[PDB]
Amino acid sequence: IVGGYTCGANTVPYQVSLNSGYHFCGGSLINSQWVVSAAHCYKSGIQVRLGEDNINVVEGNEQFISASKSIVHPSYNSNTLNNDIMLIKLKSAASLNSRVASISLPTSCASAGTQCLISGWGNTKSSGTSYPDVLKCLKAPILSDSSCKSAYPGQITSNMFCAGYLEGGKDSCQGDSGGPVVCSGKLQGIVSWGSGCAQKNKPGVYTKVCNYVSWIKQTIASN
Ligand SMILES: N=C(N)c1ccc(CNC(=O)[C@@H]2CCCN2C(=O)CNC2CCCCCC2)cc1
Numbered sequence: 001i002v003g004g005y006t007c008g009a010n011t012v013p014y015q016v017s018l019n020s021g022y023h024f025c026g027g028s029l030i031n032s033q034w035v036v037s038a039a040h041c042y043k044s045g046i047q048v049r050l051g052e053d054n055i056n057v058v059e060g061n062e063q064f065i066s067a068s069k070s071i072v073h074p075s076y077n078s079n080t081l082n083n084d085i086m087l088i089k090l091k092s093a094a095s096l097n098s099r100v101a102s103i104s105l106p107t108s109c110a111s112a113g114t115q116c117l118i119s120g121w122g123n124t125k126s127s128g129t130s131y132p133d134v135l136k137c138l139k140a141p142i143l144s145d146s147s148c149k150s151a152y153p154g155q156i157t158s159n160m161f162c163a164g165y166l167e168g169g170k171d172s173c174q175g176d177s178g179g180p181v182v183c184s185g186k187l188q189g190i191v192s193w194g195s196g197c198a199q200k201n202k203p204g205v206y207t208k209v210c211n212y213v214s215w216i217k218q219t220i221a222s223n
């Protein structure tokens with residue numbers, strides 16, 4: 001997150017870190033057995049880390065649980081990042097508490113202009129690199145689809161939306177991949193892609209979660 005702030009420990013209790021020896025992606029807890037992340041975060045050997053604030057210090061509220069199964073969206077296209085969404089099953093159910101909580105799925109999509117919270121452990125610099133160890137937060141509005149498509153001609157699909165600031169300085173970034181965009185109490189996006197980070201007229205592009213709720217619900221019910 002570039003241009004954001006320190007959230008504070010466990011103030012985003014649905015935020016997960018995916019670990020394969022190291023943090024490599026975010027995710028969102030949607031019930032005690034399942035996480036949703038980006039398809040481009042797929043890899044073998046994932047451990048889900050819940051209850052995290054400093055990802056390099058054991059502070060006392062963590063739960064580390066191996067994934068038993070990954071399900072990348074059937075229609076994910078890695079070349080275009082269309083349908084950039086993936087479900088991860090936990091080997092054992094998380095113990096849900098005030099620091100380890102699920103986020104609700106949308107009943108409908110969010111409107112342009114709605115303010116959202118984006119969070120993660122990704123790079124905080126727009127030029128160069130610095131990775132935080134505690135969780136960072138950013139308030140950002142959803143942008144109109146027209147502004148989104150003008151920024152990225154021919155590359156935006158119905159399964160994507162932009163959020164952020166066209167003037168630059170505030171955005172998600174590498175390492176935030178797979179993490180949540182929460183608006184009005186619902187998971188509406190997943191950190192997916194963009195051009196650089198926090199560059200002018202290149203806002204963040206997010207997987208449009210409201211298009212996948214039926215797939216998510218049916219998939220979790222059958223797995
Ligand atoms: N909001 C931002 N500025 C932001 C930028 C980048 C990321 C991390 N994501 C990535 O780097 C992803 C995953 C692997 C390939 N990624 C890419 O973004 C590669 N570019 C795609 C492919 C080209 C056609 C349109 C799609 C964009 C996360 C956030």
Ligand SMILES: [Ca+2]
Nearest residue numbers: 054057058059
């Ligand atoms: Ca920790």
